[PDB]
Amino acid sequence: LDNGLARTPTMGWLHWERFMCNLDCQEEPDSCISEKLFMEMAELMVSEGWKDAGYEYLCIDDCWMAPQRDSEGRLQADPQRFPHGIRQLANYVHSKGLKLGIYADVGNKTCAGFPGSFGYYDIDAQTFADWGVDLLKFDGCYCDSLENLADGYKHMSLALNRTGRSIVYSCEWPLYMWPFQKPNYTEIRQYCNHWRNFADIDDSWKSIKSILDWTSFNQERIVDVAGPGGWNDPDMLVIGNFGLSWNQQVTQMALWAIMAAPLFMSNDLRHISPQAKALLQDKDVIAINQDPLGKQGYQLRQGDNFEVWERPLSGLAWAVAMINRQEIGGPRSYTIAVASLGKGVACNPACFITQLLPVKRKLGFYEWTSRLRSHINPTGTVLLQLENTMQM
Amino acid sequence: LDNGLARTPTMGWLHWERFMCNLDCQEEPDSCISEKLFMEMAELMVSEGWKDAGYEYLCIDDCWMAPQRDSEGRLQADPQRFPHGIRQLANYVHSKGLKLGIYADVGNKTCAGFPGSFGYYDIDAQTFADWGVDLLKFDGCYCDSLENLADGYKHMSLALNRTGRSIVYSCEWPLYMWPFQKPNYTEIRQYCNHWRNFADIDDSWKSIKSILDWTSFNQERIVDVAGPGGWNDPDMLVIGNFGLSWNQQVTQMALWAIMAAPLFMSNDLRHISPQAKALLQDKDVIAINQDPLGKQGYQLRQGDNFEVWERPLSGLAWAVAMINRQEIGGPRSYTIAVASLGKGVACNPACFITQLLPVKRKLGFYEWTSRLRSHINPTGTVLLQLENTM
Ligand SMILES: *[C@@H]1O[C@H](CO)[C@@H](O[C@@H]2O[C@H](CO)[C@@H](O[C@@H]3O[C@H](CO)[C@@H](O)[C@H](O[C@H]4O[C@H](CO)[C@@H](O)[C@H](O)[C@@H]4O)[C@@H]3O)[C@H](O)[C@H]2NC(C)=O)[C@H](O)[C@H]1NC(C)=O
Ligand SMILES: *[C@@H]1O[C@H](CO)[C@@H](O[C@@H]2O[C@H](CO)[C@@H](O[C@@H]3O[C@H](CO)[C@@H](O)[C@H](O[C@H]4O[C@H](CO)[C@@H](O)[C@H](O)[C@@H]4O)[C@@H]3O)[C@H](O)[C@H]2NC(C)=O)[C@H](O)[C@H]1NC(C)=O
Ligand SMILES: *[C@@H]1O[C@H](CO)[C@@H](O[C@@H]2O[C@H](CO)[C@@H](O[C@@H]3O[C@H](CO)[C@@H](O)[C@H](O)[C@@H]3O)[C@H](O)[C@H]2NC(C)=O)[C@H](O)[C@H]1NC(C)=O
Ligand SMILES: *[C@@H]1O[C@H](CO)[C@@H](O[C@@H]2O[C@H](CO)[C@@H](O)[C@H](O)[C@H]2NC(C)=O)[C@H](O)[C@H]1NC(C)=O
Ligand SMILES: *[C@@H]1O[C@H](CO)[C@@H](O)[C@H](O)[C@H]1NC(C)=O
Ligand SMILES: *[C@@H]1O[C@H](CO)[C@@H](O)[C@H](O)[C@H]1NC(C)=O
Ligand SMILES: *[C@]12N[C@H]1[C@H](CO)[C@H](O)[C@H](O)[C@H]2O
Ligand SMILES: *[C@]12N[C@H]1[C@H](CO)[C@H](O)[C@H](O)[C@H]2O
């Protein structure tokens, strides 16, 4: 989408995975979807270093709205949970230096069962712009047919444009298409700044594995269509929650950087370990995700329960990820000729290799003819940056 | 098995899950199945507080053997990786106040393809006894018949007894039988100090859940047979490795306590987080696992992606575990009548409840009328101790 937005993958926080559709403010006030949750999360995005690291969009997912539209046919904030309305939350969020995302559905109802945007693309798009919304995520539940799904996604895209406000547009068009027919990505790219391809993530190694396996399986179809203004969306970061080991957390962060994924944390910024915070705020790994060249990486090799991924970076640099998919035993040694990495370009005639994950370690100069030797923890990833050089 | 051993579930360290069958001492001398690995673990079991916490058996799994028996038809330690031999390793482990475990197979080969004990049960038993071995784990690969399986486990049990040496006998009889016919646990216990029920554990939450699900499904058959001298073995603790979140590690520690499981760590004691070390050394949770009554706990309830397990303890105490099996979202609220716990007896007329995991908190006095409310992390467990007011 050529709206001048998302020249790098969008970074921020989205409530869905950690907070879901919790409407019980009486019995579960610390986890219910309320203005207070977003206000508190906004404050901590400033004070705990998240905005400084690049996490800029504070995004509301499903279950923000009243059960019915107002007299004038517009969506309304839930009066109990959002008594001060979207406009005032937008002012609060803007006052902190952050931008506000909101959610809607192409179909007749949102996935949670709240009012769909069909019949109202133009008014809803205009409502969001009045409110001060800077991003829209647009789910695809309760939609008849390819024709509607396609038409709806295309309509809301144009509708948001006609508001002449800068609104990042986040689509689930490809994901709700697979059931009927293979998606067309050059079409989707025209209309959307990013697009969900695969089933919603949850707090599990299994879900991370299933997102990577779908991505590598499908990579010829999706890798080249990604670039500034249009990104593949492999769903939220779930680092800082409950289900992932340290190594599985490193694997998500490493590979979301390799895939030029948008980085939407879904966690509780009020209760996050120092180790999880440091990983999500890792300047060097965020810098790989946010590389201005904006070329998506890919799986180079697989076998013997190992995976090798790489991503081309500006200035003849490459990121390399080595995953150990063996879920038993100890760290396994993997060796590769540096000539095989970065299409033989990265280390011609030499590169300087820095390990970024699981720890940051200068490894030094490798000749084009060198072997790189690593040890990789089970379900973990070693992430390396290769800098092309002639200083050797 | 009435040999006076395993009066509480056996505690120690076993190489298999973490170190596996690594024979490459050339390229990986730090990881390979060697005498040096077992000596390093022994030193750290003393120096880092493992023995003081009750971890006492330092156990060798598969891949310690030379490829072929000796001229006198006995098992040998691999001459390069175990150059001083098992007896000398036993001597060293004993000098540190620890016990040594070793491994053999009931069939023609071990699972990793070294000498089996079929035909050699009596020699093997006497060899192990002579070497000063304090424990035998007896795997079941390369056994052609159920007849041979039963006969072998029984035979080795009787041959160990005849040596005169106190040797903890860890069996895999039920696991290898289960595909073909329902094991007779009453018979198995007569011959075994503990018995493997289920597939080898991995460094994964999937492995944990599948072991808990198998145990709760078969609980009618296995819970009542467990007791001093004979335990269900749900396999090794993998806490301190790579594959488990903190909350999944707490779940393993809590439920292994509830199930009165042997506690065999398979980790690197040279490289373990402070967190992992304090969980595995948790005095109050080990005291539940080690309760002298020796009554295995069971699943009380399952529903709404929650499980409640309980174990009756000494002196009118109960342990209660509450698992959140929902792997999406945040800490989920669970409430239960305390009158539904410990068969109606735990909190009649009242109980003091202490949370032990994920952290120690006194929750206070609960009346027989009361409800316990808890927030449980996804894939996490809340472990409580109930003390009847009397
Ligand atoms: C509604 O849709 C229209 C039609 O797509 C859309 O207009 C397009 O917007 C983009 C982004 O503003 C315009 O592209 C710019 O072109 C100008 C002049 O040629 C450049 O200055 C801009 O350069 C930026 O990016 C460069 C690198 O790519 C940087 O070098 C530079 O520093 C700038 O930051 C940019 O390329 C494009 O011209 C229009 N196209 C048309 C047909 O008008 C409009 O933005 C949409 N509006 C909303 C609010 O959605
Ligand atoms: C070989 O097989 C035989 C047949 O089972 C096996 O004999 C059994 O040995 C145990 C263990 O010694 C006997 O039970 C014990 O008897 C001793 C000696 O009198 C007691 O001290 C033991 O009491 C302990 O537990 C008490 C708790 O109530 C403590 O208060 C006390 O301090 C002790 O620690 C216990 O009663 C068992 O009775 C025999 N059975 C028979 C049939 O003889 C033998 O041990 C096996 N030998 C080997 C080498 O495996
Ligand atoms: C370890 O290996 C040996 C040798 O391969 C196994 O011994 C063999 O076991 C089979 C039983 O499965 C015997 O074959 C039987 O022959 C009778 C005829 O007498 C036939 O009716 C049966 O149906 C069957 O074919 C075979 O005789 C026997 N060989 C020897 C030398 O004893 C042994 O069973 C293996 N042990 C284990 C525990 O797997
Ligand atoms: C995928 O969709 C794109 C965009 O709709 C298609 O590309 C355009 O198709 C129209 C006619 O339908 C032509 O006017 C343009 O020449 C095409 N390319 C553009 C605008 O870049 C494309 O046909 C579709 N791809 C496939 C394989 O069906
Ligand atoms: C919404 O419902 C109406 C009424 O049945 C129906 O005509 C329409 O096809 C539905 N629209 C979508 C986009 O699902
Ligand atoms: C199970 O084994 C015990 C001990 O060998 C025996 O007394 C009992 O009769 C057996 N029961 C069945 C159902 O086979
Ligand atoms: C769409 N199952 C829904 C959720 C909202 O109800 C959430 O936004 C998911 O990410 C999306 O796929
Ligand atoms: C038996 N797969 C084998 C292993 C040894 O080769 C190990 O001991 C397992 O724990 C056991 O079940």
From Swiss-Prot, chain B:
One of its GO terms (cellular component) is lysosome. The keyword Disulfide bond applies. It comes from the Eukaryota. Changing Y55H: In FD; loss of enzyme activity. Changing Q299R: In FD; uncertain significance; decreased enzyme activity. Changing A112T: In FD; uncertain significance. Changing P9S: In FD; loss of enzyme activity. Changing I211V: In FD; uncertain significance; decreased enzyme activity. The active site is at D139, D200. Changing G329S: In FD; loss of enzyme activity. Changing V238G: In FD; loss of enzyme activity. It is found in: Lysosome. It catalyses: Hydrolysis of terminal, non-reducing alpha-D-galactose residues in alpha-D-galactosides, including galactose oligosaccharides, galactomannans and galactolipids; a globoside Gb3Cer (d18:1(4E)) + H2O = a beta-D-Gal-(1->4)-beta-D-Glc-(1<->1)-Cer(d18:1(4E)) + D-galactose; a globoside Gb3Cer + H2O = a beta-D-galactosyl-(1->4)-beta-D-glucosyl-(1<->1)-ceramide + D-galactose. Its main location: other. Changing E35Q: In FD; has 52% of wild-type activity. Changing N197S: In FD; uncertain significance; decreased enzyme activity. Galactosylgalactosylglucosylceramidase activity is stimulated by saposin B and ammonium chloride. It is an enzyme of class 3 (hydrolase). Changing N218K: In FD; uncertain significance; decreased enzyme activity. Coiled coil: none annotated. Catalyzes the hydrolysis of glycosphingolipids and participates in their degradation in the lysosome. Homodimer. It is linked to Fabry disease: Rare X-linked sphingolipidosis disease where glycolipid accumulates in many tissues. The disease consists of an inborn error of glycosphingolipid catabolism. FD patients show systemic accumulation of globotriaosylceramide (Gb3) and related glycosphingolipids in the plasma and cellular lysosomes throughout the body. Clinical recognition in males results from characteristic skin lesions (angiokeratomas) over the lower trunk. Patients may show ocular deposits, febrile episodes, and burning pain in the extremities. This is Alpha-galactosidase A. It comes from Homo sapiens. The gene is GLA.
